[PDB]
């Protein structure tokens, strides 16, 4: 077959990273350790720790785009009212 | 030494240009091929002196 251009990934055996030396790795069977391990103390303090970092990056952009729409919904509710009679005649035309 | 190119090799400034005035005379001329049968702005084609 014709070989195409080289890329930044290989396969099993020649993945294309750097050479390693001196790292050991241990493991146990899944059949040998407990069932139903990760249920509690994850969604008690651990999962509570995760979104505690990334909630001041969402709710501050949310508190501006919800102040802005709720403020302009009490204004297309006052211009089409009876007390908003002289203030609609000047704005639309 | 420190002269004109960005991502293009700019030494082809008009070493790309006057022949694509004639590929522009071959692709806008390509739009002088498919505009037929579509008599909408082909008043811009059918005023030639023969036929």
């Amino acid at each position: 077959g014709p070989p195409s251009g080289k890329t930044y990934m290989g396969w099993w055996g020649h993945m294309g990273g750097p050479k390693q030396k001196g790292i050991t790795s241990y493991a146990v069977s899944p059949y040998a350790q407990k069932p139903l391990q990760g249920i509690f103390h994850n969604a008690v303090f651990n999962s509570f720790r995760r979104f505690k970092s990334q909630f001041l990056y969402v709710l501050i952009p949310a508190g501006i785009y919800w102040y802005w729409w709720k403020n302009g919904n009490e204004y297309n509710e006052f211009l089409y009212s009876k007390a908003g009679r002289e203030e609609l005649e000047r704005v639309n035309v | 030494t420190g002269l004109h190119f960005g991502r293009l090799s700019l030494r082809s400034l008009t070493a790309y240009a006057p022949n694509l005035m004639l590929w522009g005379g071959a692709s806008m001329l390509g739009l002088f091929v498919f505009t037929e049968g579509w008599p909408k702005f082909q008043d811009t084609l059918y005023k030639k002196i023969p036929l």
Binding site: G10, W12, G17, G72, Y75, N76 | -
Partner: protein
């Protein structure tokens, strides 16, 4: 070698969903691309069975949808799946594309992966328009009138493009008979663009939430990411069950249960909810030539994002100014969708004018200024000079 890597066709299955080297670090946001292969199978399969009981003439169109719903055996199961499933098709695709610009995968070497994905998003908007015009309700007539009238603003070309798009002089009977035949075909062009989309992924693989390379710690697809796949596929079909059987008409307009009339006009003409932010951009420009240019050059502004990111780190994980401007772009796409279902009034014309400028200042003014400030702030915070 085994038989699964010796056969012609099984080695295509083995290289993609069995022994494909995946990173060890990816989370549940890399599952939205798998649901979209199931979402496209559902919408094609339920539509071929509904095409056996449908008549595309303009005097029979709002009676073959009702013949399906009361006479066909389990015909209400077929339709409600093909009307809430397409709104489920879009909620996943909005979350697929939003992940890929957070982790920032559009970068090198995956730019062809990002460019064939923008073509899929254009062809997906076009099918949902062409099929919603096949019910021929009251929203289905005045939605095709407003959109096809925009192509008359092209100078010296306009009224010979609309009369070719209509087959007549308004939204007639040849307009509905050509919109069904194009509704059958473009779902088969999307499926050939998904096959080309998977090819550009096989040569570089997926990214990771860290951004850095992942060729040092990899895991095969079988027994780990197939059993991580089925967690979200059983959650998908469970919320696709709580709509088709309990609230089958919440995502829809009641005016589509009136047959379409070219003589009485509705009090409001508003789109389906996933075309609403693109509707407020068209209505914000007070010209029908500069309004149709702006709305088409808002799906095609994604192609300038590979050339506008000036940072050296990939993805917005460790970037705290490029994370505050990702969540301004999110709630601006929600405020744009809200305004496209309002009336043309004060202040919903100046609010839809500012917020369609923030759609364009992100990709062109906000990205390259903030992705350059960070490159200096990662430098002078370390280098002792």
């Amino acid at each position: 070698m085994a038989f699964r890597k010796s056969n012609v066709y099984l080695s295509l299955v083995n290289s993609y969903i069995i022994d494909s080297p995946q990173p060890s670090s990816i989370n549940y946001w890399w599952n939205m691309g798998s649901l979209l292969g199931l979402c496209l199978v559902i919408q094609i399969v339920t539509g071929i069975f509904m095409a056996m009981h449908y008549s595309s003439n303009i005097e029979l169109a709002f009676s073959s949808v009702e013949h399906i719903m009361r006479d066909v055996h389990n015909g209400y199961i077929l339709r409600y799946l093909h009307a809430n499933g397409a709104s489920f098709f879009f909620m996943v695709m909005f979350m697929h594309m939003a992940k890929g610009l957070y982790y920032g995968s559009y970068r090198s070497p995956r730019v062809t992966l990002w460019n064939v994905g923008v073509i899929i998003f254009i062809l997906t908007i076009a099918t949902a328009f062409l099929g919603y015009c096949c019910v021929y309700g009251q929203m289905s007539h005045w939605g095709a009138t407003v959109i096809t009238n925009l192509f008359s603003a092209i100078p010296f070309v306009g009224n010979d493009i609309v009369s070719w798009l209509w087959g007549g002089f308004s939204v007639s009977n040849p307009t509905i008979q050509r919109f069904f035949a194009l509704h059958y075909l473009v779902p088969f062009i999307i499926a050939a663009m998904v096959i080309m989309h998977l090819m550009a992924l096989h040569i570089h693989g997926s990214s990771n939430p860290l951004g850095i390379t992942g060729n040092l710690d990899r895991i095969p697809m079988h027994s780990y990411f197939i059993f991580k796949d089925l967690v979200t596929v059983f959650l998908f079909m469970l919320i696709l069950a709580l709509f088709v059987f309990y609230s089958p008409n919440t995502l829809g307009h009641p005016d589509n249960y009136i047959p379409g009339n070219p003589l009485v006009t509705p009090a409001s003409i508003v789109p389906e909810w996933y075309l609403l932010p693109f509707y407020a951009i068209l209505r914000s420009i007070p010209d029908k030539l500069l309004g149709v240019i702006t709305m088409f050059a808002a799906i095609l502004v994604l192609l300038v994002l590979p050339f506008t990111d000036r940072s050296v780190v990939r993805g917005n994980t460790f970037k705290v100014l490029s994370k505050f401007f990702f969540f301004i772009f999110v709630f601006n796409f929600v405020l744009l969708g809200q305004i496209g279902a309002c009336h043309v009034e004060v202040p919903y014309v100046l609010m839809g004018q500012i917020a369609t400028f923030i759609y364009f200042a992100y990709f062109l003014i906000i990205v390259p200024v903030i992705s350059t400030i960070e490159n200096v702030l990662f430098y002078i915070g370390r280098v002792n000079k």
